[PDB]
From a paper:
In this study, to demonstrate the utility of virtual screening with protein dynamics, MD simulations were performed on Trypanosoma cruzi spermidine synthase to obtain an ensemble of dominant binding sites with a high probability of existence. The structure of the binding site obtained through MD simulation revealed pockets in addition to the active site that was present in the initial structure. Using the obtained binding site structures, virtual screening of 4.8 million compounds by docking simulation, in vitro assays, and X-ray analysis was conducted, successfully identifying two hit compounds.
Numbering used by the authors:
A (entry chain A): 10 to 18, 20 to 169, 183 to 237, 242 to 293
B (entry chain B): 5 to 170, 183 to 294
Amino acid sequence: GWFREENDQPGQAMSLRVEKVLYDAPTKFQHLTIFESDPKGPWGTVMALDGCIQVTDYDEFVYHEVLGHTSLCSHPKPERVLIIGGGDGGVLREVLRHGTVEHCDLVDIDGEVMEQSKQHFPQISRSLADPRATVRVGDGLAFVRQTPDNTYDVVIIDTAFYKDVLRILKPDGICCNQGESIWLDLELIEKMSRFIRETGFASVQYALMHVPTYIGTLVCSKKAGVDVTKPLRPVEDMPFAKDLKYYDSEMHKASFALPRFARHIN
Amino acid sequence: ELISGGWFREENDQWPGQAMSLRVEKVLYDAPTKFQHLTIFESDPKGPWGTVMALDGCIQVTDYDEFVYHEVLGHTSLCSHPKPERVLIIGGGDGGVLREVLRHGTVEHCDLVDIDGEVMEQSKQHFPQISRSLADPRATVRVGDGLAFVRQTPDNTYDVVIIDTTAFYKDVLRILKPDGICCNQGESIWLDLELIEKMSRFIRETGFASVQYALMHVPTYPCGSIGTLVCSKKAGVDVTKPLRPVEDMPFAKDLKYYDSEMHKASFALPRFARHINN
Ligand SMILES: C[S@@H](CCCN)C[C@H]1O[C@@H](n2cnc3c(N)ncnc32)[C@H](O)[C@@H]1O
Ligand SMILES: C[S@@H](CCCN)C[C@H]1O[C@@H](n2cnc3c(N)ncnc32)[C@H](O)[C@@H]1O
Ligand SMILES: COc1ccc(C2=NC[C@@H](C)N2)c(O)c1
Ligand SMILES: COc1ccc(C2=NC[C@@H](C)N2)c(O)c1
């Protein structure tokens, strides 16, 4: 058998050989597929949601180190962190390396994702049981609505709402979401960036990522003048810097340099 | 083999258990050549790709993305050179690199050698926007093996050598002038990290003073990432910061990918790979 991935945005398909199907069922919220890919390939275990791959053993370090560290290294002293989505635990694992982090909340709508990540991606999900984390099953929209002003230093969106994200951040707050591809959806990113800036964020900057197959991130600061393109707390000064396989300060700087057709985003 | 409405399947033997497929709208060419199997087709009009070129079942050019790897190859090499007057391109029968090279006012002549005359022929036909450079009076376009060509070239002929391909490295160093920049199509840091390190190491060894690997951001590559080894003949040259920034040259604003920030960014590698560049 072969898992086939397709996008409405057509005439193209990416196919992965299925070694063993590990989970395949709808959930309260979406279709969840987990499979062991060809042992001769690099991919390891693969997770898709509604047919779109979200996690592979092989590349997960990329998007988890970028979202975790681009945001937290852009913050003067991130103590309280919210993660919306992230039920696999990867961003949480990266967030929790930082010795400044006192507490992280994680809210994912789908408790089956977390359950299934516990069983099939222990390399990613081990962080869910960290004492500095509180993991909640529920809607992030509903969650941010019922959250006090000035609760978090950083909100990470790993999937009215953006007013509430702005509201729940402290004055020096960093918001970081999963952006669309500049190839696939330049139009969406332009719109998101304007949207976010208008709802109140002072600077919005798009960071690009290098994935083995195809993504990036919007990094949003509440206070202006702050150049998020240069690390405010370089990871190189921190004890875990050599533990990371993708992210460092040079990659952080490089990530905001956009091909010319997309530059006007930043 | 290929039919209209059928699917083009791209597989890679270094990466088993995956395939990237494209829906074929119109088969344009599908025959063996003297050297390779050339396959050209119009892809799904509702997709972004347009016309697609494959050699031995490996896609080499699409209308959508060609600007990336041609701008990266053309300008990273030429903006690292004080005065690129005479330019060699090995491979590149489609003319894409050549079109970028010739944007530069300092170029007097560019030689181009591609082993397969059918590639150039079929690029003139089905990718006019890439191959229009093949008719430029400042270009001499030749059918031949690049191995024999550089073997037969005098010492200190070229300011820049660009290897754009699907003992020889001794020759490239030899035929470059003292200020020479060599540039090649590099393998993926994902697929073949080791090849790049062995390659970078033997290039330096054969006698190039510095070697730096640049990364590109492509819309799709089912084999990881495509890169470029940018190599300096003279010592004390830093290819990672543009020697002649494109922002000063009248055609900068015509480029869709490359600029100085992209140039600098391209040499920042993922931590797992950074030892390649230091
Ligand atoms: C698996 S994670 C994939 C990203 C790479 N780590 C994506 C998660 O976002 C969750 N998600 C989607 N919408 C929401 C909302 N509205 N709230 C919380 N979590 C959400 C969804 O259940 C996935 O687990
Ligand atoms: C099409 S180009 C790759 C597309 C990026 N412009 C790859 C070309 O290299 C040629 N090639 C391969 N081997 C050689 C040799 N030995 N010499 C010259 N050209 C070569 C081959 O015919 C393609 O046209
Ligand atoms: C080679 O097949 C693959 C492999 C990985 C992904 C993937 N990893 C994260 C997310 C962006 N997509 C994919 O979509 C297809
Ligand atoms: C949509 O599927 C695609 C699209 C593009 C490529 C490609 N562009 C440059 C060359 C190296 N490969 C591909 O292989 C498959």
